[PDB]
Design a protein around this ligand. Structure first.
Ligand SMILES: CC(C)(COP(=O)(O)OP(=O)(O)OC[C@H]1O[C@@H](n2cnc3c(N)ncnc32)[C@H](O)[C@@H]1OP(=O)(O)O)[C@@H](O)C(=O)NCCC(=O)NCCS
Ligand SMILES: CC(C)(COP(=O)(O)OP(=O)(O)OC[C@H]1O[C@@H](n2cnc3c(N)ncnc32)[C@H](O)[C@@H]1OP(=O)(O)O)[C@@H](O)C(=O)NCCC(=O)NCCS
Ligand SMILES: CC(=O)N[C@@H](CCC(N)=O)C(=O)O
Ligand SMILES: CC(=O)N[C@@H](CCC(N)=O)C(=O)O
Lengths: 166, 168
């Protein structure tokens, strides 16, 4: 499973992957937001059809020592082949290369992420001072990490998970 | 003066980037709070101080706007270190990021008309995207994007800036 940095030509395929699960499962992403985020997105290619994109994932930095895995989606016709886990592996190595100590994820796929050492947590693990700084973010994923009131209706039932990197 | 090293930002650079932005924030540079700078760290570049190891004397970002279009934004040099080639070295590296990303056009909104003319930027009027791309880009939460789109509610804050474009 080859995982590589996304290119702008991958964005339509990424968009189709997100829309497949957008709603309760994945937070929506419109096209412009995906172009804007292309330098943090990664894609998995089909093993035998060169250059076809069957999965995507992004690592989003939240603070100096904290990152989040987000927008991990695998083509439903290509699941169960190691693609999801390979994307998470590469995204975690990005977090390491960026010298992050902790990675967050908000998800229903509790056991999938438990394979990588993520454990369920309660609350929001940042100081009160960092919490107030992060509230000025415009990114809705950040508000979901912060558990802000106006996104509470959209995330009910998700598990909050954290991985401390070695 | 010799060409400085321009490298990808690390999270430990973000406070210094923040101070560079705050120096010019307002009429010149769009404001950037800490969380936004951390979130954008994977598109920021910094010029290393010529003599102070691990210190940065300038910063800049390449922001993707669409499949074939990018923007140079948040270029800032320590005012006590200007006029030594650091600004141009950052823009040089940002333009190579744009080509590696297969962008055909790079935008900048700026008062420094001549600084950017050295790289081939020319002044334009309006917003060079189709009506369909314009409508998609309007859904962005990024204020710089709204400035690129020339939306009404940001017109008072960008008066006097030149809109410039470089075709790669
Ligand atoms: C969750 C999701 C990303 C997993 O995608 P996937 O491609 O099926 O993931 P994998 O194939 O790597 O692993 C699934 C199973 O395939 C099998 N597997 C086969 N080959 C494997 C390999 N080389 N490595 C690991 N597992 C493999 C395993 O049995 C694995 O079971 P496990 O998770 O209990 O270990 C996918 O279902 C999805 O897109 N869901 C919606 C988006 C979402 O929920 N994202 C999480 C929030 S961001
Ligand atoms: C505009 C700005 C980025 C330029 O920074 P800078 O480091 O002074 O840029 P440079 O030193 O590379 O070039 C400026 C002049 O110094 C001259 N220069 C002097 N010594 C030099 C040297 N050893 N090597 C190279 N150039 C030198 C250059 O000739 C140049 O003149 P030119 O533009 O006519 O070619 C900086 O003043 C700034 O941060 N302004 C506020 C933020 C801003 O306006 N950003 C733009 C919008 S994002
Ligand atoms: C898209 C994505 O990354 N998943 C959401 C889950 C919450 C939601 N569906 O709105 C999240 O914060 O991770
Ligand atoms: C940070 C940044 O780069 N801001 C605007 C300048 C316009 C403004 N809002 O002052 C720009 O395109 O240069």
């Amino acid at each position: 499973p080859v995982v590589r940095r996304a290119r702008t030509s991958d964005v339509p395929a990424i968009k189709q992957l997100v829309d497949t699960y957008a709603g309760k499962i994945l937070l929506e992403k419109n096209l412009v937001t995906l172009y804007e985020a292309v330098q943090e997105f990664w894609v998995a290619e089909h093993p035998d059809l060169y250059g076809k994109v069957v999965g995507c994932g992004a690592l989003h930095v939240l603070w100096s020592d904290l990152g989040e895995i987000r927008t991990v989606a695998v083509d439903p016709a290509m699941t169960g082949h190691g693609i999801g886990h390979a994307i998470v592996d590469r995204l975690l190595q990005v977090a390491r290369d960026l010298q992050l100590q902790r990675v967050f994820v908000l998800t229903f796929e509790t056991e999938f992420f438990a394979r990588h050492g993520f454990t369920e947590i309660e609350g929001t693990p940042v100081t009160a001072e960092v919490f107030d700084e992060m509230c000025r973010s415009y990114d809705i994923g950040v508000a979901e990490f912060l558990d802000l009131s106006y996104v509470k209706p959209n995330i009910l039932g998700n598990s909050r998970m954290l991985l401390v990197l070695l």
